[PDB]
């Protein structure tokens, strides 16, 4: 009942552990899935980054698999517009 019900709520077949996490902590598990959907595997970030973001001109590499890495420089931080938005200018992997 729950496994099916959850599959619908996160959009894939949950492993037994996801099911049981869901049973234990339903709200928190779903929130975690939003976070994952919005932000990804933040787990891979060094802690200072994970907690403070980046400094102007800072360069970082995030290993994601064996032999795959995100090289991320930060180059400018825009002023906000009228809608309270900013534009950050990164170089991720030379783009």
């Amino acid at each position: 009942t729950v496994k099916a019900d959850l599959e619908q709520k996160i959009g894939y077949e949950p492993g037994d552990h996801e099911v049981i996490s869901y049973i234990m902590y339903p709200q928190v598990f779903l929130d975690y899935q939003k976070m994952q959907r919005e932000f990804g595997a933040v787990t891979l970030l060094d802690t200072p980054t994970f907690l403070h973001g980046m400094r102007l001109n800072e360069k970082i590499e995030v290993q994601i698999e064996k032999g795959k890495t995100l090289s991320i420089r930060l180059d400018e931080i825009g002023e906000p517009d009228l809608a309270g938005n900013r534009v950050l200018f990164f170089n991720l992997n030379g783009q």
Binding site: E38, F39, G40, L51, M54, I72, L88
Partner: protein, 464 residues
Amino acid sequence: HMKKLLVANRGEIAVRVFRACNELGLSTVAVYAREDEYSVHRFKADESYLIGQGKKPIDAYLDIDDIIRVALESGADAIHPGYGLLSENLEFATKVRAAGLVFVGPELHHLDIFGDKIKAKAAADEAKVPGIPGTNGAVDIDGALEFAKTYGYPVMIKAMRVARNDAEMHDGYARAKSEAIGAFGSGEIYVEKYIENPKHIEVQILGDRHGNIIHLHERDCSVQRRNQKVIEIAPAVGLSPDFRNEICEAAVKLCKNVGYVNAGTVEFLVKDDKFYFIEVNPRVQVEHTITELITGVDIVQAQILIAQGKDLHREIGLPAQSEIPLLGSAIQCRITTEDPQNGFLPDTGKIDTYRSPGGFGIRLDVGNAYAGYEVTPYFDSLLVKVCTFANEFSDSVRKMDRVLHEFRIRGVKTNIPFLINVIANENFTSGQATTTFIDNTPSLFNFPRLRDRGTKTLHYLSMI
């Protein structure tokens, strides 16, 4: 003769033409709406001029007078219409020639006869090419059954319900007159023979003023969804050489018989070794690219040269019908913003990333898909036309698969997931797909959720 050319169009096809112009040492002139001020094609030309001022953007590209105003103040000797917009419009073609300018296209006769579906069906009969059996016009119910009696079932009732049967025909024809008394209001009711699971096959035609008329083989555009072309291939590798030759000859026939001029395409439907004329496109098509690839014939160049009066064989340099090449196969996919996990609603927004792949067997007729471009809601959704090509159709597929997978377009949704599924499918790879193949294959709409780790991480880094 001709020094300068204005393209009464935008985006990929405007750029296509400028390229062909440039290669023929023609100066170029582009026109652009305000809303399209950031379009590539605007800056790819030697000079460009605002049009339609104050109007809605699509209306501006339709503003026949204002275009010509520009054509004249600019000094243009000719106008290429492109495809869509005014390219099939008689009023425009007439007014352009009227102001002593070359309209790159066929004769006003041809626009007239082929723009109206009754005069065309007529001209096709006169030409002795079989069309879709139709009730010569609208009909009483004793007549609908008379029609179904000859030609046989199934058949299709149009105010449109299908009717595999005499029972279903009564059912259909009376429910049509009810559906018809409250929908438009009027209910004269015509019936056409119905063509269950057809291949859509079309034939590329060139003719010049000196009566020459060749075909550039065919193109199998069967892979449609909601009868919208998604992928075109060339030749129709699904069908045998001779049956193909026969469909082509029949389009030469139709065009010799009206003495067609410039480039144009002859649409057929096809089913179990019979074929039914359905249309003529008195213009270049979006999918002309692939035919170019399999023949070696630059169609847009030819278009232009034909409109300088030149001769297909003598000056332009094309061989006789039977010596026209057929070099393997080619495939086109239009990469659009159509989000397939949102019912193909064209996404809009700023494009963050785009780099164009390349290499052997890749061709790219790119639209407005670049880093930083604001996709607006006004124009169509096309980002970039991708062709691939290879001796073996199997390999034309391989290359398309690689390329679709190579693309990294961030900022807006695209249809790539959909295209990938479609070229994976054995019905397609075999060359046998029909018009109903997509709508009857539900498997094509299961899409892997994509992880975009770069993007999400940068969202996080930014947030914090």
